[PDB]
Each structure stands twice: as C-alpha cells, then as structure tokens.
Ligand SMILES: [Ca+2]
Ligand SMILES: [Ca+2]
Ligand SMILES: [Ca+2]
C-alpha cells in the first residue's frame with residue numbers, strides 16, 4: 001500500500017528499467033524513483049520532473065508509460081497500434097500506454113481509450 | 128471500430144444486461160444503447176442521460192461501469208474492494224469500476240486508480 005512506498009535511487013532499479021529510461025527518456029530528468037509494493041506484488045515507479053511516469057514490473061519490464069504531460073515516445077508503441085491510432089485518430093497523441101499478460105490499453109489526447117489483445121486485435125473502444 | 132456501432136433498443140440487449148440496468152440504474156434514463164464490435168469482439172454499451180455508461184460483454188455481464196458524473200452504485204463493488212477504498216480513501220467515491228478475466232480496476236474521485244486481482248488482492252496503486 002501507500003505506506004510501503006520506498007524511495008530509491010535509479011541505480012537500485014532493475015537494469016532493464018534503467019536501460020529503458022536511458023533509451024526513451026534521455027531528455028527528461030528523474031524527480032523520484034520508488035519501489036511500490038503490497039503483500040502480493042512489487043513494482044518500480046519513476047516520475048520525471050515534467051510529471052510523466054513509468055511503472056515497471058519486478059523484472060524491469062515496463063507496464064505503464066504515462067506521458068500525459070507530453071506524449072508517449074513512439075518507439076514504445078507496437079507498430080500495429082501506432083498504425084491504428086494514426087489512421088483513425090490522426091489528430092490525437094498517445095498520452096498513456098499500459099500492458100499486462102493479456103492486453104494493451106492506450107489513452108489518447110482526445111480522451112478515447114483503446115484496448116488491444118496481445119496480437120494487436122482491437123477489443124474495446126471507449127469514448 | 129467506430130464505424131460498426133449499431134444503435135439498438137434496450138430490449139435487444141442480453142437479458143442479464145437488461146436486468147443489471149433495472150437493478151442498479153432504476154433512477155436513471157437511457158439516452159442511447161448500442162452494440163459495439165470489431166472483427167474479434169462484440170459488446171453492448173448503454174449511456175444514461177446524465178452521461179454515465181455501462182459496457183457489457185456479449186453475454187450481458189458487466190465489464191465497465193463508468194459513473195464519473197455521480198458514483199458507482201455500491202452494490203456492484205466487491206465487498207473487499209469497498210472496504211479497501213472506504214478504509215484508505217475515506218473521502219473518495221468510486222467513479223468507475225472495470226473487470227476482466229484477470230483483474231478489477233477502480234478509479235476514485237481523487238484520481239487514484241487501484242487494481243485488484245480476482246481474489247481482491249491489491250496489485251497496483253497509481254496516483
Ligand atoms: Ca467500449
Ligand atoms: Ca470499456
Ligand atoms: Ca486493464
């Protein structure tokens with residue numbers, strides 16, 4: 001829970017996560033890194049000085065990239081999802097992307113939320 | 128996709144969905160009901176005249192209750208989740224709840240989003 005939050009240095013994060021930050025957020029500055037946990041999970045969150053955030057699983061694989069203050073770096077977005085978005089919502093940016101073992105969620109700047117299965121088939125549009 | 132939306136009467140929705148509306152939204156008025164679909168899914172959405180929405184799977188089982196204009200009827204919220212929310216966020220209402228085959232998402236009026244597994248163990252807090 002919230003009481004279990006533990007601030008850490010970026011160097012205490014999994015190496016996969018450290019690499020991801022360097023790869024995609026080289027131009028951003030880290031405001032706070034923490035380990036988030038409860039009885040049955042552990043994750044890592046990094047918040048940048050512009051308010052954007054990335055959350056990683058215990059292995060350092062991203063699970064949430066929330067760039068609502070700018071937009072999500074395109075390299076992170078699966079090509080089939082980027083094509084769907086740029087075809088059908090050409091005036092929107094992707095503000096957040098999430099993934100788990102079953103789907104991707106994408107939140108657009110026009111407030112639409114899309115969900116895709118792991119084979120990038122559309123399974124929900126919410127406006 | 129958006130082009131496939133098909134407006135319908137509420138009586139064309141699965142009976143489980145019709146029952147859910149009557150059970151929990153007796154005081155609301157239906158503005159629009161539709162079948163939503165793409166190649167690999169079908170769902171049903173009902174929007175009320177106050178802007179709240181419920182989405183159901185093809186069988187009429189709710190998957191999203193978005194009551195951001197009021198709050199989610201408490202009877203819909205699993206007891207363990209209601210207890211977590213009312214303990215740790217006593218000033219918040221639940222504005223949306225979602226579920227799938229693996230987790231529940233809950234969005235609170237203070238903008239916090241919580242995720243629980245199907246056994247109601249906390250697996251994410253996002254602020
Ligand atoms: Ca939908
Ligand atoms: Ca939905
Ligand atoms: Ca989800």
Ligand SMILES: [Ca+2]
Pocket residue numbers: 036043045055251252253254
């Ligand atoms: Ca989190």
Ligand SMILES: [Ca+2]
Pocket residue numbers: 055063064251252253
């Ligand atoms: Ca998260």
